[PDB]
Amino acid sequence: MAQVKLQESGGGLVQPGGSLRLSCASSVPIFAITVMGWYRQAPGKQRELVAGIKRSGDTNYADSVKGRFTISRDDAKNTVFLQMNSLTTEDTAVYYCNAQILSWMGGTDYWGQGTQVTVS
Amino acid sequence: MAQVKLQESGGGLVQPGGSLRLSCASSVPIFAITVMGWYRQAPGKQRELVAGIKRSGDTNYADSVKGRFTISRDDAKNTVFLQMNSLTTEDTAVYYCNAQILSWMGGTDYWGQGTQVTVS
Amino acid sequence: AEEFPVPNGFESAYREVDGVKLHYVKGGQGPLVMLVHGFGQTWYEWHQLMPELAKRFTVIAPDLPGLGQSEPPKTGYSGEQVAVYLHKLARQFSPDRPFDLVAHDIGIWNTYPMVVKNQADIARLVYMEAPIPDARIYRFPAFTAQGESLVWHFSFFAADDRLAETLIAGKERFFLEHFIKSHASNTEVFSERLLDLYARSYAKPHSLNASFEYYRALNESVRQNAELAKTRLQMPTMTLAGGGHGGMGTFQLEQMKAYAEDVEGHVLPGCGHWLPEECAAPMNRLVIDFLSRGR
Amino acid sequence: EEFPVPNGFESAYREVDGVKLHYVKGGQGPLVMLVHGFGQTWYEWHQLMPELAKRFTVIAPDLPGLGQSEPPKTGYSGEQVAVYLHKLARQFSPDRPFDLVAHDIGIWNTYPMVVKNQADIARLVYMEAPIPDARIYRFPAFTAQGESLVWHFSFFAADDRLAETLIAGKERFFLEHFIKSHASNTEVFSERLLDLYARSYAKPHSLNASFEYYRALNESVRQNAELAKTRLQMPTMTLAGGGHGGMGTFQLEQMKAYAEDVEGHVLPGCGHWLPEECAAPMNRLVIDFLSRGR
């Protein structure tokens, strides 16, 4: 049985300059996840890490999104949020939640199916 | 190259109840060796560990030789000694010097040529 | 008088075994179950499972030699040496009947020799949240893509010249809280009161040293288990592991398969290393079910 | 002055992107920059420096936050620290490429500079540490010989100031233990040498800076995964100790996946601290490598 299931929501269609809040819900309490992260895959592009957040709260971001995207942990909501500001067409991709759970021998990756983001 | 060369001295034929002192010298200073040890193998049997001595000075022995054999370290002579007291025919084997050098990724084993010890 | 509160219906007692005065907590009626704790804790991690098992069993939860209120071992800290004390303690209360063994963390290290050398004395076996000492522990990572490893303490505790004692002395509460929380998924369960009780116990000078001596004997336990492991385990066996941050994951059952002929394994989602406290309900349920079935 | 300056050399500072860097400079000719590692300062090069100065201009900086250098203002990842070090070297050799010699985390803090400014790097010597990449996740937490040589990676990288809290009040004890456990030749670390090193990194900002390099290691891995898309082209030498405490074969084995032109040496009976444990053979190999065809 998968040790966590992830479900992304809150993507969709937005015009350039608009904003979106992505959401990732975890079937287990999010503090059981060592690193939660957001990835994206666009047509004709590489799969990119956009943001990641540790249990401590330390965050890291891709250069292309610094200052526009913000990743956070909401423990009560059991949700990790990706706030996306000042969007451009080049941010069109499917955004994946990623759960990294560290076990003694090493980490295990878990992925959601992704939520569609279109900027037009 | 070879990171250490080991040269054993000693062994031979001795009567039950007798004693022998084995010697192993190291081509590098012996402090560069994480674990110095003595193994033995008799024909038709498995190679077994007899004694080992760490850089800290901690020693360890096989059950069959505890209290009779003594491993020691001579830093000035760059030599490890195996004092074998109260020998029985059950100690007959070829005795091999063993050097373990720990590197960041793991250890490397080096072996001497071995000396025959016969108790009869 | 007592480091930890004794659950209602239980008794705090001592028994000298081979010269070593062992502390233990006992309760219930029926066949014997022994619960053996791991590093950083005492018998008290079992205090929620004990009243449940006491409804059908005689339950004994000793303090490992040198830890809790037990005296240091007189022989040594290798698995084979410590297993002698624990077998003798269990066999004294169930000399005619086989007993059940539940073990956590280094409780595994300190019982596996007993089990493989006295299989007829062990009815059913539950192991959780630690590897059996064998060559596979040499493949644990010193560092990971997620930051600090969960196993770096193996080499920290085993370092020469009393490194860990020297660095941790005066900082026992701080270190233990960091160790416990970094191996937990559900840190909420460790209140100030619980963290204080554990920290005060293992901060006793002989307990702080004894804790690390278990790790300094780890290479010796590996060599011993390389010989003992030639005989597979035959009794019914269950493995439990945390599937959240801090747990053993799939490795617990995967390694046990090379040891047990009859083993079932469970990985508990959202749970770390400290299963009895992080995930009391699912873990108590799995242990109670495994030891009740067919009885 | 934290450490004695060799005769003919000078202790000086330069400010680079707001950060005041300390270094020791001497000699004449083309530039060689020597980059120290964890637990030490420029002074580990004080035996090789007068030898190199006969042909070269020698600069040995203190890493940001360590020795007498100020903490970085950007961060401790490899790319961030390499900017301070690249700009410092190009200040003294703005027109000609220079040589780089780096030890331990000096490798972490210079590799991004090398890969992105190859025309600035004539010859490259790296010793006694991995380049930060996914391979470092394969170092063992515990070994058949006891305590591993790499567990400090996670100790230093642990959250909540663990290493600072435990080492505070024991800087000399810990640093002596760390150095000797990674050395094959422990005799060269006298009471006087250990005291100088312990005094330097016991400064609160230096103790923290020491560990922040390891807390930035995962980020350095992410950075170097992209940078490594371009192989290194300059002549490269790697050195490693073959005694207890050294990198062994892994040093050259990894570099082969980075450099097209690389030779490697494993020095018997030598641990991690090659410049001090095995000054003569290391000095000779380095001097020869930077002297060929010149």
Residues C277 and C45: beta-carbon distance below 8 Å:
yes
What's the 3-state SS for C81-101? HHHHHHHHHHHHHCCCCCEEE
CATH for B49: 2.60.40.10
Only one residue has tokens 């190199």, namely D52
Residues D247 and D220: beta-carbon distance below 8 Å:
no
Question: Could you give the domains of chain C?
Answer: 10-292 (3.40.50.1820)
Residues C135, D257: Cα–Cα separation, whole Å = 29
Has residue B117 been placed in a domain? no
Q: Which of C105, C146, C181 is the best substitution to test chain A (most A C-beta atoms within 10 A)?
A: C146
Has residue B115 been placed in a domain? no
What single-letter DSSP state applies at residue C11?
E
DSSP letter string, D125-168:
EEESS--SSGGGGGSBSEETTEE-SSTHHHHHH-STTHHHHHHT
C149–D141 CB contact, under 8 Å? yes
Provide the terminal-to-terminal Cα distance of chain A, rounded to the nearest Å. 39
Nearest to C22 by CA among C85, C103, C113: C85
Question: Cα–chain-centroid distance for residue A95?
Answer: 6
| Closest Cα in chain A, distance from residue C121 (Å) | 31
Token pair recorded at residue D232: 């290194």
Residues C288 and C53: beta-carbon distance below 8 Å:
yes
Chain C residue numbers touching A32 (CB-CB < 8 A): 185-186, 244-245, 269-272
Residues B107 and B34: beta-carbon distance below 8 Å:
yes
Residues C185 and C270: beta-carbon distance below 8 Å:
yes
C138–B106 CB contact, under 8 Å? yes
Burial of D91 by CB count in 10 Å (0-12 exposed, 13-18 middle, 19+ buried)?
exposed
Residues B10, B16: Cα–Cα separation, whole Å = 17
Please indicate if any CB of chain A lies within 8 Å of the CB of D137: yes
Give whole-number Cα distances, A36 to A58, A99, A109, in Å.
Answer: 11, 5, 10
Residues A58, D75: Cα–Cα separation, whole Å = 14
C161–B56 CB contact, under 8 Å? yes
Has residue A42 been placed in a domain? yes
Of D141, D147, D218, the CB nearest to C141: D141
Please indicate if any CB of chain A lies within 8 Å of the CB of D219: yes
Has residue A26 been placed in a domain? yes
When divided into structural domains, chain A yields a total of 1
Has residue A31 been placed in a domain? yes
Has residue A98 been placed in a domain? yes
D269–B108 CB contact, under 8 Å? no
**Strand, helix or coil at D47?**
coil
Token pair recorded at residue C175: 């270190």
Domain that holds residue A54: 6-115
C160–D170 CB contact, under 8 Å? no
Of C138, C160, C220, the CB nearest to B60: C220
Give whole-number Cα distances, A58 to A52, A54, A110, C145, D136, in Å.
Answer: 8, 6, 20, 15, 22
Give whole-number Cα distances, B75 to A46, B26, B29, in Å.
Answer: 58, 10, 8
- Evaluate whether chains A and C are touching (3 or more beta carbon pairs less than 8 Å apart): yes
In terms of CA atoms, which chain D residue is nearest residue C142?
A: D141
**Strand, helix or coil at D82?**
helix
Has residue A120 been placed in a domain? no
In terms of CA atoms, which chain B residue is nearest residue C217?
A: B60
Neighbours of chain C (3+ CB pairs under 8 A): A, B, D
| Closest Cα in chain B, distance from residue C160 (Å) | 7
Residues C168, D167: Cα–Cα separation, whole Å = 9
Please indicate if any CB of chain C lies within 8 Å of the CB of B60: yes
A106–D219 CB contact, under 8 Å? no
Of C144, C147, C270, the CB nearest to A28: C270
Residues A80, A38: Cα–Cα separation, whole Å = 9
What single-letter DSSP state applies at residue C7?
P
Chain B residue numbers touching D247 (CB-CB < 8 A): 103-105
A60–D159 CB contact, under 8 Å? no
**Strand, helix or coil at A106?**
strand
Give whole-number Cα distances, C192 to A83, C44, C182, C197, D193, in Å.
Answer: 35, 15, 16, 9, 44
Residues C130, C256: Cα–Cα separation, whole Å = 11
Please indicate if any CB of chain B lies within 8 Å of the CB of D293: no
Chain C residue numbers touching B49 (CB-CB < 8 A): 223
C223–B49 CB contact, under 8 Å? yes
Residues D67 and D75: beta-carbon distance below 8 Å:
no
The CA-CA-CA angle for residues D3, D8, D13, to 5°, reads 55
The CA-CA-CA angle for residues B77, B81, B87, to 5°, reads 155
The residue ranges of DSSP E strands in D146-257, in sequence order, are: 146-147, 236-241
Half-sphere exposure (Cβ direction) of A100: Cα atoms closer than 13 Å: 17
Residues C190, C180: Cα–Cα separation, whole Å = 9
A56–D137 CB contact, under 8 Å? no
Residues C232 and C259: beta-carbon distance below 8 Å:
yes
Nearest to D247 by CA among D239, D255, D259: D239
| Closest Cα in chain A, distance from residue D72 (Å) | 18
The reported resolution of this PDB entry, expressed in Å, is 2.4
Residues D290, D236: Cα–Cα separation, whole Å = 10
Residue B12, number of CB atoms within 10 A of its CB: 10
Residues C249, C246: Cα–Cα separation, whole Å = 9
Residues A95, A87: Cα–Cα separation, whole Å = 14
Question: Cα–chain-centroid distance for residue C184?
Answer: 16
Has residue A1 been placed in a domain? no
Name the β-bridge partners of D127.
D103, D239
